[PDB]
């Protein structure tokens with residue numbers, strides 16, 4: 001008795017290409033010698049704050065949207081053994097469609113405009129002004145994993161090593177309830193951001209007036 005599941009039904013792991021504009025920016029960011037790489041943390045905390053604003057805005061008319069979790073917070077978890085730095089927020093999260101669209105497609109206009117601005121003398125720290133600060137994670141990360149849960153969909157995982165493609169798959173792991181977890185697999189030369197002394201310095205310098213609690217976990 002040796003059965004075989006010739007066809008699993010849905011495709012578990014789906015691979016897609018970035019819009020060319022996004023892929024070219026990711027290549028720029030992952031290989032640049034820009035000396036102020038710490039700004040990645042500002043951009044990711046700002047994205048987390050925006051996501052928390054969103055859920056809060058939504059709950060004003062429908063308090064039940066907080067049934068998946070009442071606390072609105074940001075957590076930063078450096079992990080020296082796995083060389084990961086994780087930023088967790090309990091914000092709005094992303095459905096599967098929005099996950100593919102928001103990280104793989106809709107950033108096209110922002111990444112295009114940002115690269116034109118860079119060509120004309122702008123600098124990388126302005127990335128957030130084009131709505132695409134998420135990709136600054138590749139200043140310090142060789143790989144990024146995003147775990148996300150939106151009230152209207154199941155938990156999903158996104159990942160990319162900036163090779164022009166990304167993958168999406170249902171995540172049946174530890175439920176996060178609601179929100180997004182951005183997991184940075186750090187480059188060898190950027191492990192300074194695994195140290196509590198360094199991470200605090202960056203938060204105090206760049207994110208000292210964010211309207212949500214930021215907790216650091218060692």
Ligand SMILES: CN(C)c1ncnc2nc[nH]c12
Nearest residue numbers: 047048051091093102134180
């Ligand atoms: C980057 N992006 C589209 C995001 N969407 C929703 N929640 C987020 N938390 C951090 N980044 C997020």
